[PDB]
């Protein structure tokens, strides 16, 4: 069961900019109308020129299985199918990017839960996954729960344009649409689960370089030297810029596809 919980970021500074009561009464209706009327027409599949290409597991249904529990004026707590809660968070973000002039942001926590979980626990988890995305950059999404070292250099949440660019590179080569993989990777999930175990060696010690050639051997003996040509060679510029390796951010793209598959 997929749960998203989002709100507009640095909104109190926006309404403090209004200097007259007619100007406040305009900015507080237009922000109210996005989470009251126009969030319905996003779930209704409209506005395709404005939204565009978003990370979708399955293609967009005529009737989405989405139950909007709350949507207040900045805050929204929406539950639904975990494949369509995932896509809608990128579909709400892009429309809110263009309903404004690109000046106000969102932040979304995302959880994936058992059915038979108490709902006060699904709120208290996603409220923590929202606040983890909120004290980091306030234009960034929490996608999936993820392991990372406690060195303070790694952060669990993706920025919006970062994850949506990680999806346009890594998903059209391993994923075909509607819960199936591509050619030459059918019946090869054992590549992908062990690929996350090589990602766990980055988690246990990021200074150890043992993950670099184990990726090259495991992609090598399967003949898949074309897939993932940057998980084999270490990025020296990332060690220069003090940003994580590309083996670290591939978890949010693989683990969604491994959940999309029967697994």
């Amino acid at each position: 069961l997929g749960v998203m919980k989002g709100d507009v970021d640095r909104l109190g500074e926006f309404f403090s900019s209004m200097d007259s009561p007619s100007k406040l009464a305009t900015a507080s209706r237009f922000m109210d109308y996005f989470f009251k009327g126009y969030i319905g027409a996003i779930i209704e599949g409209k506005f395709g020129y404005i939204i565009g290409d978003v990370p979708s597991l399955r293609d967009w249904p005529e009737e989405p299985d989405i139950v909007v529990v709350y949507a207040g004026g900045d805050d929204f707590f929406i539950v639904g199918a975990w494949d369509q809660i995932f896509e809608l968070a990128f579909r709400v973000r892009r429309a809110f990017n263009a309903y404004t002039g690109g000046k106000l942001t969102l932040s979304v926590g995302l959880g994936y839960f058992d059915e038979r979980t108490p709902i006060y626990r699904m709120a208290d988890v996603v409220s923590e996954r929202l606040d983890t995305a909120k004290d980091e950059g306030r234009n960034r999404v929490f996608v999936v729960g993820r392991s990372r070292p406690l060195d303070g250099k790694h952060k669990l949440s993706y920025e919006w344009n970062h994850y949506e660019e990680l999806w346009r590179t890594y998903a059209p080569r391993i994923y075909a649409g509607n819960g199936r993989l591509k050619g030459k990777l059918e019946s090869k999930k054992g590549l992908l689960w062990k690929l996350l175990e090589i990602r766990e060696l980055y988690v246990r010690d990021p200074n150890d370089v043992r993950w670099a050639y184990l990726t090259a051997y495991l992609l090598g003996r399967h003949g898949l030297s074309d897939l993932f040509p940057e998980l084999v060679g270490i990025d020296t510029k990332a060690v220069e810029r003090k940003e994580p390796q590309p083996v670290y951010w591939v978890d949010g793209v693989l683990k969604i596809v491994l959940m999309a598959v029967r697994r």
């Binding site: 038979r116 979980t117 108490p118 626990r121 208290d124 606040d131 303070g152």
Partner: protein, 190 residues
């Protein structure tokens, strides 16, 4: 949004100084699933259970002011009994167990007319700035009534607190702790 502070940053917030919040909470609230297995057919029935899982060096502690003859007569022999039974929760699954050490804490606090409560309050008079806590526990299988406490860190003025004794249909009277633990604090104009 911050809930706790360091031993050093607490002494700054008592003086209305600039302070910083800690980066890391020493525990987590995980949800371990258990199961109830049938004795003949091994049928499963999952329920969920939440916990508090501490880190490698982390733990929990409380503070004691009082005469030393009451401490090593009552508080100190009681905490070693409680090292082998629990503090709340499923003590039969090994939850509330610990090892006890005794140390010394010293807090720099400004002398004032007001004070913060480092425990639950159950005040006599109405406090200054507070935060409601509403809980009532259990006593020998008897369900205690919910009592409006005050959460920790709330501000009182010249308040001692006071325990309420309850009946609950037992043989002995049940006292419920609501004494305050006053440390001096500096306030603005309300």
């Amino acid at each position: 949004k911050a809930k706790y502070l360091d031993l050093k940053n607490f002494e700054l917030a008592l003086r209305l100084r600039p302070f910083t919040i800690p980066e890391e909470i020493p525990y987590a609230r995980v949800d371990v699933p258990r199961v109830v297995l049938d004795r003949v057919t091994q049928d499963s029935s999952i329920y969920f259970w939440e916990e508090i899982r501490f880190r490698e060096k982390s733990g929990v502690y409380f503070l004691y002011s009082g005469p030393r003859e009451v401490f090593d007569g009552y508080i100190a022999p009681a905490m070693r009994f409680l090292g082998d039974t629990g503090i709340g929760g499923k003590s039969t699954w090994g939850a509330g167990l610990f090892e006890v050490e005794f140390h010394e804490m010293k807090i720099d606090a400004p002398g004032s007319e007001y004070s913060v409560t480092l425990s639950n309050a159950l005040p006599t008079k109405t406090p200054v700035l507070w935060r409601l806590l509403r809980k009532g526990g259990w006593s020998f299988g008897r369900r205690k009534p919910r009592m409006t406490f005050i959460a920790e860190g709330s501000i009182v003025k010249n308040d001692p607190g006071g325990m309420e004794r309850l009946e609950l249909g037992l043989s002995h009277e049940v006292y419920v702790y609501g004494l305050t633990f006053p440390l001096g604090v500096e306030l603005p104009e309300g």
